């Protein structure tokens, strides 16, 4: 009676643990990958992250400058 009215079968907890473990393992591997990706992007700078500004080239004036040699 107690088992019927207060508790559930082993399958529920078993498969819930399976799902929880799967989620947590994915989160762990995601964290490790994210750290490695950050290291690579900060080292090389070829990614979208850690992009530091440079001078905009639309500011350059391309016109004769009173002197042939610029």
């Amino acid at each position: 009676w107690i088992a019927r009215t207060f508790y559930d079968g082993p399958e529920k907890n078993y498969e819930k643990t399976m799902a929880i473990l799967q989620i947590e393992a994915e989160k762990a591997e995601l964290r490790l990958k994210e750290l490695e990706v950050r290291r690579l992007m900060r080292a090389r700078g070829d990614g979208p992250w850690y992009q530091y500004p440079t001078i905009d080239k639309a500011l350059i004036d391309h016109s004769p400058k009173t002197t042939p040699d610029n």
Binding site: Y14, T17, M18, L21, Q22, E24, A25, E29
Partner: protein, 175 residues
């Protein structure tokens, strides 16, 4: 009794002597056990008959759970958490069953010691040998894992033991 298997828990055929009264004087044990029978055993028997009929009026069953076999920790990839979970649960169940086996053998040994009385040292060599074999196997499996044991630690211990065995056999071959 049918409530337990006679093969798992064996007993000798229970030979008992027959009363050989060499004197005519009445032994108080017989009369006293007869009056015990009359004053105790019959009322208890009748109460049990009542309870057993009431139980027979309402009959229902319960089942022993069956567990499937799953791949063990050896067929598991180094980081595959799901198979490791399955294997760890299976290994823990097997560990509990092994503990119960050792318990059964120890119960056999204790019953032998009490039953054979003054000649237990000779008449319990069978149970002692069985308990020695089972104890050696159980120790080889689970002796030193400590708290925080797992299937991986047991596998590492087995691998170390059988590496030592392979080295010893190779040394014997090349002796």
């Amino acid at each position: 009794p049918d409530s337990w298997d006679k093969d798992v828990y064996p007993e000798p055929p229970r030979r008992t002597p027959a009363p050989a009264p060499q004197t005519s004087l009445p032994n108080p044990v017989t009369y006293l056990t007869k009056i015990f029978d009359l004053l105790v055993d019959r009322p208890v028997t009748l109460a049990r008959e009542f309870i057993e009929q009431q139980h027979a009026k309402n009959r229902y069953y319960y089942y022993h759970r069956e567990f499937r076999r799953v791949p063990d920790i050896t067929e598991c990839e180094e980081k595959d958490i799901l198979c490791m979970f399955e294997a760890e649960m299976q290994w823990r169940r097997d560990y509990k069953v092994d503990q119960e086996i050792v318990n059964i053998i120890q119960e056999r040994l204790k019953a032998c010691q009490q039953r054979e009385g003054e000649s237990y040292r000779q008449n319990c060599a069978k149970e002692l040998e069985q308990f020695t074999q089972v104890s050696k196997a159980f120790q080889d499996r689970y002796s030193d894992l400590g708290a925080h044991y797992s299937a991986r630690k047991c596998l590492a211990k087995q691998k170390q033991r059988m590496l030592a065995e392979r080295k010893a056999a190779k040394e014997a071959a090349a002796a």
